[PDB]
Amino acid sequence: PHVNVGTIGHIDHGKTTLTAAICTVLAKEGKSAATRYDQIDKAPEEKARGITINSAHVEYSSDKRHYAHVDCPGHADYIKNMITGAAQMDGAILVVSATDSVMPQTREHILLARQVGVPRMVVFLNKCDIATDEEVQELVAEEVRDLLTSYGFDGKNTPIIYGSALKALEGDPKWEAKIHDLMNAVDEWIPTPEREVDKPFLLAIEDTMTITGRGTVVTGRVERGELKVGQEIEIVGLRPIRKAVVTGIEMFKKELDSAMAGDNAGVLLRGVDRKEVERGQVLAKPGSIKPHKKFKAEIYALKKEEGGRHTGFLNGYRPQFYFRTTDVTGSISLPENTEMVLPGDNTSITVELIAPIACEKGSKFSIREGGRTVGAGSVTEVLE
Amino acid sequence: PHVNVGTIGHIDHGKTTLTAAICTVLAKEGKSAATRYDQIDKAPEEKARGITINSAHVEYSSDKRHYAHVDCPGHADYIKNMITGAAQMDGAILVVSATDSVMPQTREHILLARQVGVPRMVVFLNKCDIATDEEVQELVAEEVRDLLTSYGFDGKNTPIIYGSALKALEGDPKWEAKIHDLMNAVDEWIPTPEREVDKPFLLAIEDTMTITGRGTVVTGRVERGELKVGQEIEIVGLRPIRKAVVTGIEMFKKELDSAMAGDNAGVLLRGVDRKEVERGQVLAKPGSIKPHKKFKAEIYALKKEEGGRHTGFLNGYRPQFYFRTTDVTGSISLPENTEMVLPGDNTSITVELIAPIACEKGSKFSIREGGRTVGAGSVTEVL
Numbered sequence: 001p002h003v004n005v006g007t008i009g010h011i012d013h014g015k016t017t018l019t020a021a022i023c024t025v026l027a028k029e030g031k032s033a034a035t036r037y038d039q040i041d042k043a044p045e046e047k048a049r050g051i052t053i054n055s056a057h058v059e060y061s062s063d064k065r066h067y068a069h070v071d072c073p074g075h076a077d078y079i080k081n082m083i084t085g086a087a088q089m090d091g092a093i094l095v096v097s098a099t100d101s102v103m104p105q106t107r108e109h110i111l112l113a114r115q116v117g118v119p120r121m122v123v124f125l126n127k128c129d130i131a132t133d134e135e136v137q138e139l140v141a142e143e144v145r146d147l148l149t150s151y152g153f154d155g156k157n158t159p160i161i162y163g164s165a166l167k168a169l170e171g172d173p174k175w176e177a178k179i180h181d182l183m184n185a186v187d188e189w190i191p192t193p194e195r196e197v198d199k200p201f202l203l204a205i206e207d208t209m210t211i212t213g214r215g216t217v218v219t220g221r222v223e224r225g226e227l228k229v230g231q232e233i234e235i236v237g238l239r240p241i242r243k244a245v246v247t248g249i250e251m252f253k254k255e256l257d258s259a260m261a262g263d264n265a266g267v268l269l270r271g272v273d274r275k276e277v278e279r280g281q282v283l284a285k286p287g288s289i290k291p292h293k294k295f296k297a298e299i300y301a302l303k304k305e306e307g308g309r310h311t312g313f314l315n316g317y318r319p320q321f322y323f324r325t326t327d328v329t330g331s332i333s334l335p336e337n338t339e340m341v342l343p344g345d346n347t348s349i350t351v352e353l354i355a356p357i358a359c360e361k362g363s364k365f366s367i368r369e370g371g372r373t374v375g376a377g378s379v380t381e382v383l384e
Numbered sequence: 385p386h387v388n389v390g391t392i393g394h395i396d397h398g399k400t401t402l403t404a405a406i407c408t409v410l411a412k413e414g415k416s417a418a419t420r421y422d423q424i425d426k427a428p429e430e431k432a433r434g435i436t437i438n439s440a441h442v443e444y445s446s447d448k449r450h451y452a453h454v455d456c457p458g459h460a461d462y463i464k465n466m467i468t469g470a471a472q473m474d475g476a477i478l479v480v481s482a483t484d485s486v487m488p489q490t491r492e493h494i495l496l497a498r499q500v501g502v503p504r505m506v507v508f509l510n511k512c513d514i515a516t517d518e519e520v521q522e523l524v525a526e527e528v529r530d531l532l533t534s535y536g537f538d539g540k541n542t543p544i545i546y547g548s549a550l551k552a553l554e555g556d557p558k559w560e561a562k563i564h565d566l567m568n569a570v571d572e573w574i575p576t577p578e579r580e581v582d583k584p585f586l587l588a589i590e591d592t593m594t595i596t597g598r599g600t601v602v603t604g605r606v607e608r609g610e611l612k613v614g615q616e617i618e619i620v621g622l623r624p625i626r627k628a629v630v631t632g633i634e635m636f637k638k639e640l641d642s643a644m645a646g647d648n649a650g651v652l653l654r655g656v657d658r659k660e661v662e663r664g665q666v667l668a669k670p671g672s673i674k675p676h677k678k679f680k681a682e683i684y685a686l687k688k689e690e691g692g693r694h695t696g697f698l699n700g701y702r703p704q705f706y707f708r709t710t711d712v713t714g715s716i717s718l719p720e721n722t723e724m725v726l727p728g729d730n731t732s733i734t735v736e737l738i739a740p741i742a743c744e745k746g747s748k749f750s751i752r753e754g755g756r757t758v759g760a761g762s763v764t765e766v767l
């Protein structure tokens with residue numbers, strides 16, 4: 001079980017150089033492959049549910065943990081990666097050039113990280129081989145700390161390493177030591193992710209089937225947590241919420257006592273009629289998630305050359321919102337002074353659905369029109 | 385009195401080419417000067433102190449009016465120019481590429497145009513030599529109209545000319561004709577600006593004085609309008625608003641009967657004690673402007689190299705707000721999810737001053753910290 005991290009920050013501040021520096025320094029101890037800057041600086045197109053992103057992925061391990069590291073060419077790739085959940089960062093490495101201090105994309109990545117629930121951050125104050133004046137370095141560091149605090153992060157205790165990603169790539173051991181310092185800070189500051197099996201149980205219902213005399217079997221993938229026979233669940237979304245007692249769990253055709261995250265299982269609910277359950281609802285640990293018709297979210301509207309809309313949309317745009325296994329029609333309201341959202345834009349929106357869906361902070365959804373995906377979103381607030 | 389216009393729109397949609405095309409076509413009638421694209425596109429960057437705005441300037445006359453036309457290279461130049469007011473625009477020529485449709489800077493320039501008070505717009509749907517197929521052009525046109533309307537403009541009646549800036553510049557007479565259609569649209573849709581001397585009188589008080597035998601005399605520059613001896617004015621700002629009759633106007637050590645925009649004049653006020661006036665107040669036509677402690681504004685934060693802050697400021701920043709002649713301390717409240725404003729940024733803000741200052745929509749001000757200018761703003765709403 002590895003830890004997911006990534007290099008965020010303003011363009012040309014040194015994310016890719018730092019990524020190559022980590023891999024190069026760690027490869028000398030046999031803890032990574034010798035990944036070169038030019039392999040990562042290339043924009044490697046990938047596809048994650050309709051959204052095309054240029055994104056690089058490397059792997060390395062520390063003395064304590066193994067890491068999966070994401071790095072992206074463009075600011076637009078970071079927006080797309082974080083909203084869709086294609087990245088999923090247990091912790092972020094914020095690169096800030098000491099010669100430029102905080103820049104607009106530095107703030108946007110930190111805000112997006114707060115909205116998609118990135119727990120913690122470690123800062124690499126880069127280009128200190130250029131900005132050698134310590135008073136300059138401290139002024140940038142104090143600005144980064146204020147920025148982290150203003151967005152809910154622990155600016156006082158966030159580790160900030162003063163280094164040079166370039167000179168570390170060159171083999172200068174004085175600057176290589178900062179790469180070691182950054183790795184220890186990541187080991188100690190970025191928490192090990194909670195296993196999906198310890199989270200509140202959730203299963204997205206795909207099919208229903210009546211077992212005459214006993215109840216109704218609902219089938220779907222357990223997204224997180226663990227369910228046990230005899231436990232009580234809630235059926236959330238679309239229809240009025242209700243509780244049910246699980247009397248059976250089967251996967252192939254064997255009868256199992258439990259189901260956990262990753263399982264595609266049939267769940268027998270005692271006394272529930274097939275008309276009470278439908279696709280799009282979720283089984284959930286009672287009280288762990290609620291139904292909502294109104295929510296706030298950050299969205300990315302796909303460009304025309306990505307299969308998205310060809311023109312912008314206004315207030316009152318009424319598309320379909322795809323949540324896990326089904327779509328629900330909703331109406332979109334826009335923030336003040338945003339009167340048109342164009343293809344390629346990312347913006348906050350407020351959505352009033354016609355039917356309630358089970359959603360929380362961090363729920364992912366696709367915006368669809370005529371069956372094609374025109375945008376992707378991440379729920380930031382349940383507003384009901 | 386010429387009309388101030390300018391090309392706005394997303395980068396690479398043809399603003400500079402259209403600017404050169406307008407002059408080149410009208411120069412054939414002696415109504416402008418033949419202008420190549422490189423004269424404006426490759427002009428050098430600006431090498432001075434303070435806020436740095438890159439902008440080119442041309443002149444041309446249509447059949448009915450004379451025009452001063454400004455064209456800027458970068459998006460940041462348009463933000464700075466419109467917020468500070470150095471690019472005062474009685475009307476705008478929005479350039480939109482028929483190949484790319486409306487882009488984020490197209491919407492951004494329209495929003496900024498409304499906040500600084502640009503009343504009207506004509507649209508030059510450009511690159512119709514590439515995007516032949518009048519159906520494709522008409523779709524982009526409807527998108528521009530919907531965008532114009534969504535931001536408070538009359539998108540339904542806004543003149544839209546389907547042209548090609550390049551082929552007009554190169555002398556294609558079919559496309560040259562669309563330059564003349566654009567001039568007709570500007571002549572008829574862009575309203576002639578109201579004369580400065582005809583606007584409601586405003587004077588910004590700089591100095592106050594007691595002529596022991598005569599009375600209180602306030603001195604300042606007339607921002608707009610005209611003041612005549614015997615008229616009633618209002619003293620707006622820093623004190624409860626009151627009225628007073630003008631009994632004297634002095635300039636160049638002579639008693640005069642009137643003062644107008646641009647004049648620096650000492651104004652003698654009847655029944656006003658010196659403790660009732662002070663720098664930062666304004667004299668104004670009664671009811672034309674009100675004092676406010678709270679307002680909304682679009683501001684541009686100066687970069688470090690422009691003499692501004694080296695670091696970003698947070699919610700609750702309490703700087704000075706320099707209005708015409710004096711600064712008033714005030715607190716800044718930022719829009720949602722904007723927790724820090726960096727040097728070089730532009731953002732809408734809400735301000736609460738410690739004292740009421742006379743202000744209105746379009747009032748310009750500076751943000752100052754320790755005496756040095758760190759930002760420039762334009763009031764968008766008074767509360």
Ligand SMILES: Nc1nc2c(ncn2[C@@H]2O[C@H](COP(=O)(O)OP(=O)(O)O)[C@@H](O)[C@H]2O)c(=O)[nH]1
Binds near residue numbers: 010015127166
């Ligand atoms: N002097 C110096 N240059 C650096 C450093 N890190 C990156 N650069 C340079 O800055 C430029 C951008 O770095 P890159 O990693 O591409 O930035 P990214 O866009 O944030 O990935 C490249 O030309 C690097 O060589 C550093 O620590 N010191």
Ligand SMILES: Nc1nc2c(ncn2[C@@H]2O[C@H](COP(=O)(O)OP(=O)(O)O)[C@@H](O)[C@H]2O)c(=O)[nH]1
Binds near residue numbers: 397398510511512549
């Ligand atoms: N084919 C064609 N190209 C154009 C037209 N107008 C502008 N261009 C091209 O678009 C590019 C950018 O135009 P420019 O005037 O610099 O746009 P600006 O950045 O808004 O000022 C230039 O290479 C022009 O040659 C047009 O009507 N037709």
Ligand SMILES: [Mg+2]
Binds near residue numbers: 017
């Ligand atoms: Mg990079």
Ligand SMILES: [Mg+2]
Binds near residue numbers: 425
């Ligand atoms: Mg230009």
